Write a protein that binds this ligand. Structure first.
Ligand SMILES: [Cl-]
Ligand SMILES: [Cl-]
Ligand code: NA
Ligand code: NA
Ligand code: NA
Ligand SMILES: [Zn+2]
Length: 323
């Protein structure tokens, strides 16, 4: 005798697909890789209690391939498996409210994700994939498991794997609407003259080499191809924030001069991230932990600043000689 139950399959947890499954065959024999709220049930046969429940599957048919792309903006074949695998862990993490923001209690080497999530709640950023829009809204309300699992999937990081905050933000920004962001730079060499460049989108809001926005406006020394040290400085900026990054180094964060920052203690193989936010005082959020101070000095790697529109008032030759 053939026994069956009705279940629903999905790739986006919105659009459902009715299935009649044979209770003598595993989900994998019938759907391929199958997950129940992150749990891998591929090798499990249907239970009575599964009737009417929704299972994630991989995009096997054309219908599912379109739904998955429209929701996630990826066609990487393993994406849904990686998201589900991560979700099985992140649904067990805790997301405490710390100083009015959703943080993450430490687990599974997740300090880089905690400071990324805290940072997002302090900068103006809109995501493009519906999956991130929906999950980020939930994360702001305090239910951040799906958002964290999506970050891991989009960044191709597994739970427990070491992550870099700058790289994680770069991926998040790649999936955000930054088309209104513009940056104009000028590079001045005594030998080679002046070279202006215009950057757009993610490249307009990220810079690697100095933590100081003020120093970037004054001028930073970089190598020129001729071998001399040229001066690079910010000509014009149109964006709601900027992110300045550098290899970790002792750095003083002054209250009221920045939005938030990330601190990395450790080395290239093992470390830990903390988050610093400048509000009525300086708050240091370390997952679930919170401390305060009037001054802060530590190995800072990333600093975020507010912006709207900036235009330099100084001529190039003045930046080259006075930075
Ligand atoms: Cl959004
Ligand atoms: Cl996108
Ligand atoms: Na935000
Ligand atoms: Na919130
Ligand atoms: Na974009
Ligand atoms: Zn030169």
């Amino acid at each position: 005798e053939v026994r069956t139950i009705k279940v629903f399959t999905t790739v986006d947890n919105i659009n459902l697909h009715t299935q009649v499954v044979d209770m003598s065959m595993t989900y994998g024999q019938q759907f391929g890789p199958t997950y129940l709220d992150g749990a891998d049930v591929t090798k499990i046969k249907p239970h009575n209690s599964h009737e009417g429940k929704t299972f994630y599957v991989l995009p096997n048919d054309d219908t599912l391939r379109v739904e998955a792309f429209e929701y996630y903006h990826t066609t990487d074949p393993s994406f849904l498996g990686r998201y589900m695998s991560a979700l099985n862990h992140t649904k067990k993490w805790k997301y405490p409210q710390v100083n009015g923001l959703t943080s993450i209690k430490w687990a599974d080497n997740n300090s880089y994700l905690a400071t990324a999530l805290l940072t997002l709640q302090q900068i103006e950023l809109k995501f493009n994939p519906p999956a991130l829009q929906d999950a980020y809204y939930r994360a702001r309300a305090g239910e951040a498991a799906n958002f964290c699992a999506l970050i891991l999937a989009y960044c191709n990081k597994t739970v427990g794997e070491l992550g870099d905050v700058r790289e994680t933000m770069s991926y998040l920004f790649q999936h955000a609407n930054l088309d209104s962001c513009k940056r104009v730079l000028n590079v001045v060499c005594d030998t080679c003259g002046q070279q202006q460049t215009t950057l757009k989108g993610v490249e307009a809001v990220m810079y690697m080499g100095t933590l100081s926005y003020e120093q970037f406006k004054k001028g930073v020394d970089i190598p020129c191809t001729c071998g001399r040290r040229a001066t690079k400085y910010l000509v014009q900026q149109e964006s709601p924030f900027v992110m300045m990054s550098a290899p970790p180094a002792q750095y003083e964060l002054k209250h009221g001069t920045f939005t938030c920052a990330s601190e990395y203690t450790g080395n290239y193989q093992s470390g830990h991230y903390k988050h610093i936010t400048s509000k009525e005082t300086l708050y240091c959020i370390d997952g679930a932990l919170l401390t305060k101070s009037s001054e802060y000095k530590g190995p800072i790697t990333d600093v975020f600043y507010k912006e709207n529109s900036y235009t330099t008032t100084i001529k190039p030759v003045t930046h080259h000689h006075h930075h």
